[PDB]
Amino acid sequence: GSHMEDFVRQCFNPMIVELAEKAMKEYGEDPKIETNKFAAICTHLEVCFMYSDGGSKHRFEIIEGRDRIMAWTVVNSICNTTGVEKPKFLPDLYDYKENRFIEIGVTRREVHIYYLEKANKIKSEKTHIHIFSFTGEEMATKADYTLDEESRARIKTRLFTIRQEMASRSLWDSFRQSE
Ligand SMILES: C[C@@H](N1CN([C@H]2c3ccccc3CSc3ccccc32)n2ccc(=O)c(O)c2C1=O)C(F)(F)F
Ligand SMILES: [Mg+2]
Ligand SMILES: [Mg+2]
């Protein structure tokens, strides 16, 4: 039983903890052992949820936090009714306003390097990429950051609070050196 597993359960809300547990178990991993990944998946989930809450009412369809099959089911319905091309890989959101899938990224390295890796992996020009760092920087496709500045600032505040809360527990260095 790790110090980091208890921190995650105290830091994130129960709905997010459970979806993250279900995400890892779906791919045969265990949150009690891969505790840094546990924390990262929770962090990514919370960012996705704040992001979809950042726009107007019906703006975003949330793809993240679903089982593999339902996630691809919703992608197929979105494509077969928008005409947008079907992404090679599962994204995190769909933007009904801008009519594009979004891939959210949270990294403990430089947004530049992480953004390059995901762009090269995606190859799909269509899917919009939006990277957030734990230091308060971001990088989005075509310099288009989708949400207004206040909603993005709130995300960056939360990320920095997570970072200090791990620091106060000496979990931060180990978390940084895992990615
Ligand atoms: C399963 C889906 N994944 C993989 N993987 C994901 C994940 C989920 C469960 C078990 C292992 C892992 C690898 S580690 C990690 C770390 C933080 C957040 C998410 C994740 N991703 C990393 C960064 C993302 O931005 C992202 O969207 C995903 C994601 O969605 C997929 F696309 F492959 F179908
Ligand atoms: Mg995802
Ligand atoms: Mg993502």
Whole-number Cα distances in Å, 70 to 29, 63, 65: 20, 9, 10
Distance CA 9, CA 4 (A): 9
> Which residues surround ligand 1 with Cβ inside 6 Å?
23-24, 27, 29, 37, 40-41, 44, 64, 89-90, 92, 104-105
Q: Which of 49, 47, 173 is nearest to 106 (CA)?
A: 47
Residues in the 5 Å CB sphere of ion ligand 3:
92, 104
Exposed, middle or buried by CB within 10 Å (0-12, 13-18, 19+), for 146? buried
Compute the Cα dihedral for 121, 127, 132, 138 and give only its sign. positive
**Which residues, at least 6 apart from 67, have a Cβ–Cβ distance to it below 8 Å?**
22, 26
Fold of the domain spanning 1-179: Restriction Endonuclease (3.40.91)
Retrieve residue 109's tokens. 């390295």
Q: Whose CA is nearest to atom 23 of ligand 1?
A: 105
Retrieve residue 128's tokens. 């919009």
Q: Whose CA is nearest to atom 20 of ligand 1?
A: 41
Q: Which of 56, 54, 47 is nearest to 147 (CA)?
A: 54
Do 49 and 16 meet the contact criterion of CB atoms below 8 Å apart? Answer: yes
Question: Given the structure tokens 């230091």, which residue do they identify?
Answer: 135
Written in H, E and C, the secondary structure of the chain is CCHHHHHHHHHCCHHHHHHHHHHHHHCCCCCCCCHHHHHHHHHHHHHHHHHHCCCCCCCEEECCCCCHHHHHHHHHHHHHHHCCCCCCCCCCEEECCCCEEEEEEEECCCHHHHHHHHHHHHCCCCCEEEEEECCCCEEEHHHCCCCCHHHHHHHHHHHHHHHHHHHCCCCHHHHHCCC
Experimental method: X-ray
Residues written for the chain: 179
Compute the Cα dihedral for 17, 20, 25, 28 and give only its sign. negative
Q: Which of 174, 170, 109 is nearest to 139 (CA)?
A: 109
Reported resolution, Å: 2.3
